[PDB]
């Protein structure tokens, strides 16, 4: 009657060491959504959209199969909108908001950390799912 699916979402980022000449990009980053434990979300997730900043070409990035990750390069931090669509078209999409983190703190730089990570926990809650959805969520 009520099913809970824990996830983590956010991004990792790594500094080039230098501003790139062609585009002025300074970082590589990957924004993502993952199951909290090692399992398959694709049984009940149809697609996940990652809406990037307007300065990216084709900013609405759509991922239809795992892993639900988008890798890019850039120079700036901005909010990414994440929308998770389900196999049951009548189950409302879940929307997440994530501030992309690129710039390492001086503290973590002095500690010698190589990557920036900004990751959050959430729960997709399915109340009174259709019989199909209940099957897909519990295989």
């Amino acid at each position: 009657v009520t099913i809970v699916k824990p996830i983590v979402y956010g991004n990792v980022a790594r500094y080039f060491g230098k501003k790139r000449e062609e585009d002025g990009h300074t970082h590589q980053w990957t924004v993502y959504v993952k199951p909290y434990r090692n399992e398959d979300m694709s049984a009940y997730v149809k697609k996940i959209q990652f809406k990037l900043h307007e300065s990216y070409g084709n900013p609405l990035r759509v991922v239809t199969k795992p892993p639900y990750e988008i890798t890019e390069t850039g120079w700036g931090e901005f909010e990414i909108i994440i929308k998770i669509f389900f196999i049951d078209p009548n189950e409302r999409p879940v929307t997440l908001y994530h501030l992309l983190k690129l710039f390492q703190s001086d503290t973590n730089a002095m500690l010698g950390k190589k990557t920036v990570v900004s990751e959050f926990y959430d729960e997709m809650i399915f109340q009174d799912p259709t019989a199909m959805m209940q099957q897909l969520l519990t295989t």
Partner: peptide
């Protein structure tokens, strides 16, 4: 109203 900001370092 519907569009957000992008910011560089420093």
């Amino acid at each position: 109203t519907k569009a957000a900001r992008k910011s560089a370092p420093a």
